[PDB]
Amino acid sequence: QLKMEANIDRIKVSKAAADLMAYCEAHAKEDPLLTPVPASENPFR
Amino acid sequence: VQLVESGGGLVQPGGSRKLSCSASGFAFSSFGMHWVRQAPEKGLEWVAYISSGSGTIYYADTVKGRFTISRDDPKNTLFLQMTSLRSEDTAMYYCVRSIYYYGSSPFDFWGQGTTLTIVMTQATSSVPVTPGESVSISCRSSKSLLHSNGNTYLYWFLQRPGQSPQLLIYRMSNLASGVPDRFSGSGSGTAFTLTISRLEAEDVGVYYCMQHLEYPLTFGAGTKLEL
Amino acid sequence: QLKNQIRDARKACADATLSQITNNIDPVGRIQMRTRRTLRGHLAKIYAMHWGTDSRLLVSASQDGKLIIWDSYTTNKVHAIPLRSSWVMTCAYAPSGNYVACGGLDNICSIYNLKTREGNVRVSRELAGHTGYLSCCRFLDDNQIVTSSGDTTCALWDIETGQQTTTFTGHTGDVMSLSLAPDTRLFVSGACDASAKLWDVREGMCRQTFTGHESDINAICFFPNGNAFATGSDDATCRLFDLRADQELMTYSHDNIICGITSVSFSKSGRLLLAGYDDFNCNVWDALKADRAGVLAGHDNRVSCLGVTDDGMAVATGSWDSFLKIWN
Amino acid sequence: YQVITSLLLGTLIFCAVLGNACVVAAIALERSLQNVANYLIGSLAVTDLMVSVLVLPMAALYQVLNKWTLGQVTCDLFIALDVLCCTSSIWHLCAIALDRYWAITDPIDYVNKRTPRRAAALISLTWLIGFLISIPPMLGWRTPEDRSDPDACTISKDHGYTIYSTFGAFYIPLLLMLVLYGRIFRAARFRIRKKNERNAEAKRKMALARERKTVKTLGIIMGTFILCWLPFFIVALVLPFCESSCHMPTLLGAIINWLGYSNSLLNPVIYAYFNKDFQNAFKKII
Amino acid sequence: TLSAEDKAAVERSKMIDRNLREDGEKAAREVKLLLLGAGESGKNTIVKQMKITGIVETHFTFKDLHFKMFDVGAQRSERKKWIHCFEGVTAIIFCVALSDYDLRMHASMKLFDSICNNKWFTDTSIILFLNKKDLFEEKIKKSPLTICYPEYAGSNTYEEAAAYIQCQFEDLNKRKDTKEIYTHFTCSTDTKNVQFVFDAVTDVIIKNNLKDCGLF
Ligand SMILES: CNC[C@@H]1OCCc2ccsc21
């Protein structure tokens, strides 16, 4: 039990953090909560 | 689930007759109710409508007051009060069920019908068909049916010859359940057509194109398809 | 004994904090989050909610014996589903928009069919296999349901069979939260021992353990990339963990907040997360800049659950006042 | 001289309108303050603002200007609104007392059946009494005496009217409140009466606290309701009879008929600004 | 928005609200009781005499007053995470067996103190019960009582012992101005046990009602 979790594939946190930042910066254009969308296209108006 | 109706027959002009549609296998207290009449040689013609618990009751111009309506939740029995009938009132009165919210399927399950004795027009009355080919039927509306919510209040109905019709495509873009999963439709405002892909057997019938934008509930002139 | 070696590997594999990388990135400033509607139908306090798959519907289950289905755009109520046990602590919406499952102190989480030829909601399969209350029973497919209980066991089921095909074991304490990966291949859960274990569905046994809290946990969610997740407990400490690196990344805490958490969620791109505290307020936090993006008022008692639709248009929060507010 | 009277009357009217409006605003904007008792209190508060706005300023005009200069129809309108509002502002107190008595005498009513319809029934009944009292002067029973002269906007001095109105508007409520709050006092006294030495000591000192607080509360309610009217009604009941005190001092009559109006300002304080739920709601909404 | 679809939608929403309101009104003219205690303290006998797979439910009728008793001992879990569902209950029925002082009653004391001084149960009055007084009588006339707790020295009289048990149970609550406790002795065959609960509930209702008027 403890052995199978003990022997796992582990990577440096650097490229993991880079992956998170890359996805965040690629999709930062599509946070309707974050970027204020003009009221002509929000159906809660 | 089954819906059965009674009250039909023959009444002399100026008389009164009571019309009913018994309920079984469902909760009448949580469903709307509608009535659509069809002449023996013409298309459908809507009659009235009842919301849940008879909160709201409308009528058409020609049936405003002279045919009143009611419902009975505890007993699951339907009432149609009629008086002073004329020659133009004879038609097939269809016990039609429906529900209204997001994801609705109005006019989904229909009764057998009763034998009692915006302008919408369809392009072609009758079109022959051949197995394995592709044939399309178009429908035109006087005014754009797109409402402010984006919901196109367009329906296509198909009635097998001599049987109660079914829901095939509702909202002109969504496919009803229980269909053979072949039919499809597309178009834009006041410009719509029904496309049949890989037509097969038992598809002979009549297709109906009706509006729901405003509330006169007027149907099309009819579309006949024959082998 | 292996624990020391695992900890040594953990401290060896970590070198940098996300703050260093974000230090070259300017924050997105202040955003104005204003309420659009308010939903008022519940009498007793509400306990759960689950957003639909088409970003237009949601369900909420309350203690007055009722769970209810809304239309989020016009605030029209469409379904009222009477219950059998007045103790309901969880709810779920099927991805295909067909089923809803809920269950509480009695050792069950039932099944309801929405799209019925009957035209009314009925109970289909009463799943009874635990010796404790169920805190969360979500959905994988239209035919496999995953239940998490106060029985210190997470149970994967199969509705048509009626019997659990697989069982998961490994928590000393009782689990109270459960979340699914986007690919429907793995899922995680956490318990009162302040540990979260990555559960596999293929072979039915845990893979890795995630620790760092010191109290019972309240809710969790995956990062939308399918690689990380963030957790919330009663210590006012939202913590972030990823599948790959198996490490602690960012601690989400502040010195002027002292109450606990009740539910969490991520935004569409994961730029910012939510947390509805015990002081009847929500709190939007930059998921990368780690600074408080804003505060939302609007309730009086205490936040119970919240979530964001698939497309990101909306966010809805619930509280013990029995009021649901839709935000934008 | 007249400026002082004007400013004082303006201050009183402002206080009346402010208090009566704030009470209704606080009740109408919360969900924790919508039980039957608080409905009764709010409805009493609404009748008070009517009286204030529609009657107080005209009476202040009649006072400072020292004469009536508005016309016969205006005078009849004023006297009428006066009677109705000041008679529906009395009986609400006895309605509230009846509510509390029914709460304390039998719990099974308090749980098994208590619907918010009772508040509406009681409010309708009180306004019904007001309507009944104010109409007879308009229908008839008015003296044919001259009233067109300035400062003649007075109330009819028929013996029969000035006894019937006085009884049916102030004295029956006095007996009703006396009896109902006396029975509530008896019950509340019965409940309190009905190592371990320290347990006994706690019991005694607790009982001493609770046997004094009830005296204080019942006394303040009773004392305010009697002191803020009874002098006016005894004055209005003696003078028409046998021309008593022919040289009646009008300067005292000013205070005598200002107490009846001052009840409007005094009423909201005792019933609304002591309930802990209102204090908390006021702190919240402010 | 002037289409039959959304008019029907708002109609359905209005009726759902009305149905929910009626149900919420109906389920409030009812008194809810949390029946709590140890497993073998005599709960079942209480259940039978009062009446005349996790949480268990109970229903009554007694002179135009409706009760509701829950049983929370069947399941074993983290008590701290399902107790808040029980706010607004009028009274708590704590059942204790007297015979078991020498078999445990110390654990009953620890449980009583924990349940009474709950921050969520600050202002709920407590009904107490004491069962199996018979076997208590045989045990005390066969064996002494000081083995349970040597700090007490006194006669072996059943009156003095029972009074000491009552006083020991009652001296636990820290707050007394808002919460008061009623005791009662039961010999496992009584026709006067429902009456005690009726009287306790009536007293609770009256002492609460007098509070909002400013009296008491
Ligand atoms: C001064 N305002 C009250 C008014 O004074 C005249 C007699 C009377 C009877 C009922 S109300 C009333």
State the pairing for strand pair B191-196/B184-188.
antiparallel
| Buried-exposed string D116-126: b where 16+ CB fall within 10 A, e elsewhere | eebbeebbeeb
Minimum-distance CB partner of A14 among C3, C15, C228: C15
**Fold category of E30-212 in CATH:** Rossmann fold (3.40.50)
The tokens for C187 are: 């899922």
Residues 6 or more apart in contact with residue B225 via CB below 8 angstroms: B126, B127, B128, B129, B135, B137, B203, B204, B205, B206, B207
- Kindly report the CATH number that applies to the domain delimited by B2-116: 2.60.40.10
Look at E5 and B104 and tell me if their CB atoms are within 8 Å.
yes
CA distance linking residue C40 with residue C322, whole number of Å = 7
Q: In chain C, which residues have their Cβ closer than 8 Å to the Cβ of E77?
A: 132-133, 150-151, 174
Residue burial B70-94, b: 16+ Cβ < 10 Å; e: rest: ebeeeeeebebebeebeeebbbbbb
Distance CA C139, CA B223 (A): 45
Report yes or no: C43 and C86 within 8 Å, Cβ to Cβ. Answer: no
Q: How far apart are alpha carbons C27 and C294 in whole angstroms?
A: 13
Torsion of CA E199, D105, E26, E16, to 10 degrees: -150
Q: How far apart are the CA of D270 and the centre of ligand 1, in A?
A: 22
Question: What approach was used to elucidate this structure?
Answer: cryo-EM
Cα of E7 to nearest chain B Cα, Å: 9
Q: Where are the alpha helices (DSSP H) in chain E?
A: 4-26, 43-51, 105-116, 133-142, 158-170, 194-212
Please report, as a single letter, which amino acid is at residue C160. E
User: Domains in chain D: how many in total?
Assistant: 1
Domain of residue C179: give its range. 35-327
Helix (H, G, I), strand (E, B) or coil at D13: helix
Does residue C57 contact residue C77 with C-beta atoms inside 8 Å? Answer: no
Q: At C128, is the secondary structure helix, strand, or coil?
A: coil
From the list B10, B140, B3, the residue with the least C-alpha distance to B77 is B3
Residue C23 belongs to a domain:
no
Cα–Cα distance, E132 to E119 (Å, whole number): 32
**What resolution in angstroms does the PDB record give?**
3.7
Q: Report how far residue D204's alpha carbon sits from residue D196's, in angstroms, rounded to the nearest whole number.
A: 12
Cα distance between residue E179 and residue E168, in whole Å:
17
Q: Return d(Cα E38, Cα E33) in angstroms, integer.
A: 16
The candidate with the shortest Cα–Cα distance to C227, out of D21, D214, D181, A18, is: A18
Contact B32 E14 (CB under 8 A): no
Task: Report domain A2-41's class.
Answer: few secondary structures
Locate the ligand 1 atom nearest the alpha carbon of residue D90 and give its number. Answer: 11
For chain C, what is the domain count? Answer: 1
Residues whose CB is less than 8 angstroms from the CB of residue C26 and which lie 6 or more positions away in sequence, other chains included: none
Give the phi and the psi of residue C38 in degrees, each rounded to 5.
-150, 135
- How far apart, in whole angstroms, are the C-alpha atoms of residue B207 and residue B195? 12
> Do the chains contact at E65 and D110, CB–CB below 8 Å?
no
Of D106, D107, D13, residue with least CA distance to D60: D13
What pairing do the DSSP bridges indicate for beta strands C315-319 and C303-308?
antiparallel
- Put simply, the chain B residues between 49 and 68 with a CB less than 8 A from any chain E CB are 49, 51-53, 55-56, 58
Q: Counting atoms of ligand 1 from 1, which one is nearest the CA of D83?
A: 11
What's the CATH number for B120-219?
2.60.40.10
Residues whose CB falls within 8 Å of the CB of residue C164, separated by 6 or more in sequence, listed in order: C127, C129, C155, C156, C157, C158
Q: By alpha-carbon position, which residue is closest to atom 1 of ligand 1?
A: D260
The alpha-helical segments, DSSP class H, found in C101-210 are none
C183 close to C243: Cβ distance less than 8 angstroms: no
Q: Which residues contact D234 (CB under 8 A, 6 or more apart)?
A: none
* Radius of gyration from C-alpha coordinates of chain D: 22
> E17 and C80 in contact (C-beta within 8 Å)?
no
| Separation of alpha carbons C219 and C176, rounded Å | 8
Sequence-distant (6+) residues with CB within 8 A of D274 are E214
- At what angle are helices D117-139 and D72-88 packed, to 10 degrees? 150
Instruction: Give the integer Cα–Cα distance in Å for C188 and C197.
Output: 6
Structure tokens at B203: 């598809």
Q: List the CATH number of the domain containing C262.
A: 2.130.10.10
CA-based end-to-end distance of chain B: 31
- Chain B residues 164-183 with a CB less than 8 Å from chain C: 177
- Helix, strand, coil percentages (3-state) for chain B, rounded to 5, are 5, 45, 55
* Of the candidates C85, C74, C89, the residue with the CA atom closest to the CA atom of residue C36: C74
For ligand 1, atom 4, the nearest C-alpha belongs to: D83
Cβ–ligand 1 distance for D96 under 6 Å, the answer no
Contact assignment for B52 to E12 by CB distance below 8 Å? yes
D56 lines ligand 1 (CB under 6 A): no
CA distances from D196 to C150, D131, D275, E185 (A): 43, 61, 35, 19
Parse chain B into domains and list their residue ranges.
Answer: 2-116, 120-219
Residue E159 burial (CB count, 10 A): 8
Q: Which residue ranges make up each domain of chain E?
A: 30-212
Q: Give the three-class secondary structure for D248.
A: coil
Please, is E144 exposed, middle or buried when counting C-beta atoms within 10 Å of its C-beta (0-12, 13-18, 19+)?
A: exposed
Strand-pairing partners, residue B152, are B146
Residue type, C278: D
Nearest CB to B212 within list E5, E12, E15: E5
- CA distance to B154, C93, D56, per residue, from B208 (Å): 10, 35, 72
Residue C29 lies in a domain: no
Sign for the CA dihedral angle at E167, E169, E175, E176 comes to negative
Whether the Cβ atoms of residue C146 and residue C121 lie closer than 8 Å to each other: no
Give ∠ CA B22-C118-C101 in degrees, rounded to 5: 155
Q: Count other Cβ atoms within 10 Å, centred on residue C110.
A: 21
CA E181 to CA E171: how far, in whole Å? 10
